[PDB]
Structure 1
Amino acid sequence: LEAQYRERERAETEALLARYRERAEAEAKAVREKAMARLDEAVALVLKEVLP
């Protein structure tokens, strides 16, 4: 019983991780794509506070 429950759990502790990876990477992209448009604005705020 334990024998058919250990392999069960193994295949679920693979399924769970597999989905986490897909969100993680898509939400990694969502932090890239959000920045690269509001990118010149950051450089502006930085520049403006180094040169005084």
Structure 2
Amino acid sequence: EAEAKAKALEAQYRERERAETEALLARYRERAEAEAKAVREKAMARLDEAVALVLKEVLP
């Protein structure tokens, strides 16, 4: 009974292990792409308001 419980117990929780590792990997993929498009989107609202003033600042 000990070795039977150990075998099926390992079966169940290793399957939960792989379920976990996909269940967090692909979700952090989709959030990372959302935040990449978010930071590019907030950036591409001012990208020539900044470069105009700093090319003013560089030029003597």
Under TM normalisation by the shorter chain, which class is it? 0.7 to 0.9
TM-score by length of 1: 0.83
Equivalents in 2 of 1:3, 1:23: separation in Å? Answer: 31
Identity, % of aligned positions = 100
The Cα of 1:45 is off from its aligned counterpart by 2.7
Question: How many residue pairs were aligned?
Answer: 52
Displacement of 1:36: 1.0
Structure 1 unaligned blocks of 5 or more: none
In structure 1, distance between residues paired with 2:24 and 2:50: 37
**TM-score, normalising length from structure 2?**
0.74
| Runs of 4+ deviating beyond 4 Å | none
Q: Deviations over 1:2-36 (max 9, x none)?
A: 12201211111111111111111011000111111
CA RMSD of aligned residues (A): 1.1
